[PDB]
Curated annotation (Swiss-Prot):
UniProt gene name: HGF
Residues included from the entire protein: 126 to 211 of 728
Naturally occurring in which organism (per UniProt): Homo sapiens
Domain Kringle: start-end pairs: 3-164
Protein name (database record): Hepatocyte growth factor alpha chain
């Protein structure tokens, strides 16, 4: 996970370059800047290698001591986590808006019985977000999110949604 949530208190990624483009000094190094932010004094904050970190929780976000002797420390510019349209595992928790199947067929709305009559109504699956015609995996089947299809010859089909890469 190379994105930050909020100010990146939980950031444990591998970015090692500051906002202005300076290579980070290793946390366990005293060169060029002497400091006390050592891994042994900040257990759980993962002050490893020279990765940008926010061990105390400050505004700018994750930061590091810089290899430039003239710049003691500088914040790093890491993108905010914005991933959405992806699935974790087989997507029991998927609640995005993909509405086409793996074969390219437009999904039938869950509350519609046309062309396919079925039982997967929102009122019978409260909490599964069977809204609009979005792909869903309400019963937790290994096929991933699926939908009834608008092709009268294809009752249902799993959709094609890639795995996430920013969850944890």
């Amino acid at each position: 996970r190379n994105c930050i949530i909020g100010k990146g208190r939980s950031y444990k990624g591998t970015v090692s370059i500051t906002k202005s483009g300076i290579k980070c000094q290793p946390w366990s190094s005293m060169i060029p800047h002497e400091h006390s932010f050592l891994p042994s004094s900040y257990r759980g904050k993962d002050l490893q290698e020279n990765y940008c970190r926010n061990p105390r929780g400050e505004e700018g976000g994750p930061w590091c001591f810089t290899s430039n002797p003239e710049v003691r420390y500088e914040v790093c510019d890491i993108p905010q986590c914005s991933e959405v349209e992806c699935i974790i595992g087989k997507g029991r928790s998927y609640k995005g808006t993909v509405s086409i199947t793996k074969s390219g067929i437009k999904c039938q709305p869950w509350s519609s019985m046309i062309p396919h009559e079925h039982s997967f109504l929102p009122s019978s699956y409260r909490g599964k977000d069977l809204q609009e015609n979005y792909c869903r995996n309400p019963r937790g089947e290994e096929g991933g999110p699926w939908c009834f299809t608008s092709n009268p010859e294809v009752r249902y089909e799993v959709c094609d949604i890639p795995q996430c890469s920013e969850v944890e």
